[PDB]
């Protein structure tokens, strides 16, 4: 017989449901891997390919409805030609709270009486563009801003912030990691920002 997949896990970023999996031990040159998706509310999985040679295959295109839907079930299944191993699947429904969330962009600006920054909320193109992350988490959202000099932290529920550098000078860099006040979802460190006040 052939070994089952070593590890099969869900990497669901904001509307980037990129599945990742561990290969079968001692995979052949004839070895291939399946990629699958399933959404909760559906009684059985959905398929992505007869062969993925890659360890992974994005199911986002079918999983575009991941964020709103009741949940998801996904899998990967290595195969070696005629003889096939069994699948390894995610026991736990794939939701946004499993999905490491992220924002769209951040910025830093200096004004006459204060500094300002106005961040962007992830809205992936592949996602159906009428609905964006900014739109689903309407009332509760909360994200930490870290500001450090090039060579300090606060928790915020707003895309925009100002800081002590408002009337100041110096080199300071920022990161934002999102969350939802309702949900403890494990955000992902979003795109960096840094600005000179000098």
């Amino acid at each position: 017989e052939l070994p089952s997949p070593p590890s099969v896990w869900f990497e669901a970023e904001f509307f980037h449901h990129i599945l990742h999996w561990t290969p079968i031990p001692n995979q052949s040159e004839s070895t291939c891997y399946e990629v699958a998706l399933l959404r909760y509310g559906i009684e059985s999985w959905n398929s992505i390919s007869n062969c993925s040679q890659t360890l992974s295959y994005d199911l986002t295109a079918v999983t575009l409805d991941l964020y709103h839907s009741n949940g998801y079930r996904a899998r990967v299944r290595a195969v070696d030609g005629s003889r096939h191993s069994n699948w390894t699947v995610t026991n736990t429904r794939f939701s946004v709270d499993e999905v490491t969330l992220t924002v769209g962009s951040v910025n830093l600006e200096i004004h006459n009486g204060f500094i300002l920054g106005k961040i962007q909320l992830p809205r992936p193109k592949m996602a159906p563009a009428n609905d964006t992350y900014e739109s689903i988490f309407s009332h509760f959202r909360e994200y930490e801003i870290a500001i450090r000099k090039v060579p300090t932290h606060k928790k915020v529920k707003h895309e925009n912030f100002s800081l002590l550098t408002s009337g100041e000078v110096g080199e300071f860099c920022v990161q934002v990691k999102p969350s939802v006040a309702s949900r403890s979802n494990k955000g992902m460190w979003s795109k960096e920002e840094c600005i000179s006040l000098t």
């Binding site: 509310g41 009684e43 949940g71 736990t92 429904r93 709270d97 309702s182 949900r183 403890s184």
Partner: protein, 145 residues
């Protein structure tokens, strides 16, 4: 409420994050992907009789399932105890909001009877006619509108 709307973010954050500790085990053991998600919560329970049911569901969470799931597997039990705790902490900040706003007079209704136990037994059954006239009182409101 008693600044209940000031706390609304923290209570749910703590319930979801408290749940997260046992989620791996519970979602791992419920592998048959059954689609019972207690959907009716948002889609239903409108009207006085219906609205209280969602609360009954709250009591199911805090009371029915939490303290059984705590001992169903004992090694991780703080994680389910935290589920009972995190639903009592929300129910208690609820009712204190027509979905749960309560009324305290209904206890003046009973205790003032129990004040004279031997004689309130009589008076509660001597003020029955006025009870009729008030059940009728809101009957003729509930009928007109």
């Amino acid at each position: 409420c008693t600044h209940f709307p000031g706390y609304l973010p923290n209570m749910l954050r703590d319930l979801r994050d408290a749940f997260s500790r046992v989620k791996t085990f519970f979602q791992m053991k419920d592998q048959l992907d059954n689609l019972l998600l207690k959907e009716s919560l948002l889609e239903d329970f409108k009207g006085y009789l219906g609205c209280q049911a969602l609360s009954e569901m709250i009591q199911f969470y805090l009371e029915e399932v939490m303290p059984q799931a705590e001992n169903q597997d004992p090694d991780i039990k703080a994680h389910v105890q935290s589920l009972g705790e995190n639903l009592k902490d929300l129910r208690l900040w609820l009712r204190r909001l027509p979905c749960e706003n309560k009324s305290k007079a209904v206890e003046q209704v009973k205790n003032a009877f129990n004040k004279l136990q031997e004689k309130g037994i009589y008076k509660a059954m001597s003020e029955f006619d006025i009870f009729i006239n008030y059940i009728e009182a809101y009957m003729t409101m509930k009928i007109r509108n």
